[PDB]
């Protein structure tokens, strides 16, 4: 029996597969096992695998082809979400030097959060602001973190009007922080037509 492993692999390493197999049969090998259980075992021991196919090719060969999920953001913190809203996780020894945007929300809200992250990032992009973090509460209030580390508190209201107010007001907040030797730390927008600004000393 030869075991042929194929597909584009960014997180899986070969011991992940062989362990899934031995942990089911024995220290001996694998051929006329059920291909559907070899497939199910691998789906369950490797939660970052989005698709795996297991197929017997004679002479004597078992061929496994892998498709991995691809993260576009960390989800809450220890997990990850892809561009279609799917949730998965990767042992953090293997992801500890990646730098991804950061989403947060209640346990089944990834798609909703990712949608809001997309829409709001679009608007901030029209003014060359870029979104590093986005958190949504069970009540569906929003807080954003720019790449320049300013936090924005949007609460629950028309988040897009409050977003536009930040951008309008930003040049004076920056002149003001410029003048007093401080840095902008956050901008609370949860008012009818104003903003409260918290400062911080310069790093």
């Amino acid at each position: 029996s030869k075991l042929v492993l194929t597909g584009e692999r960014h997180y899986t390493r070969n011991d992940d597969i062989r362990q899934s197999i031995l942990a089911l049969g024995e220290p001996g090998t694998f051929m006329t096992q059920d291909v559907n259980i070899i497939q199910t075992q691998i789906e369950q021991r490797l939660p970052w695998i989005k698709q795996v196919s297991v197929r017997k090719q004679w002479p004597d060969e078992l061929k496994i082809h892998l498709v991995e999920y691809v993260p576009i953001a960390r989800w809450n913190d220890q997990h990850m979400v892809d561009a279609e809203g799917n949730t998965f996780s990767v042992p953090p020894e293997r992801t500890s030097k990646q730098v991804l945007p950061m989403l947060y929300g209640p346990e089944g809200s990834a798609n909703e959060v990712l949608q809001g992250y997309r829409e709001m990032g679009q608007m901030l992009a029209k003014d060359r602001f870029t979104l590093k973090e986005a958190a949504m509460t069970a009540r569906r209030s929003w807080q954003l973190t720019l790449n320049n580390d300013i936090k924005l508190n949007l609460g629950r209201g028309d988040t897009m009007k409050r977003l536009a107010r930040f951008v309008e007001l930003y040049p004076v907040l920056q002149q003001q922080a410029q003048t007093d030797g401080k840095r902008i730390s956050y901008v609370d927008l949860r008012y009818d037509s104003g903003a409260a600004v918290g400062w911080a000393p310069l790093p």
Binding site: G157, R190, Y191, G194, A196, G198, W199
Partner: peptide, 24 residues
């Protein structure tokens, strides 16, 4: 919890010591 601070903030124009307020 933070619902209270949203009304406190939105319904009455209240802030927190140290913050600067801007009205447009």
């Amino acid at each position: 919890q933070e619902a209270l601070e949203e009304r406190a903030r939105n319904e009455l124009s209240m802030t927190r010591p140290g913050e600067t307020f801007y009205r447009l």
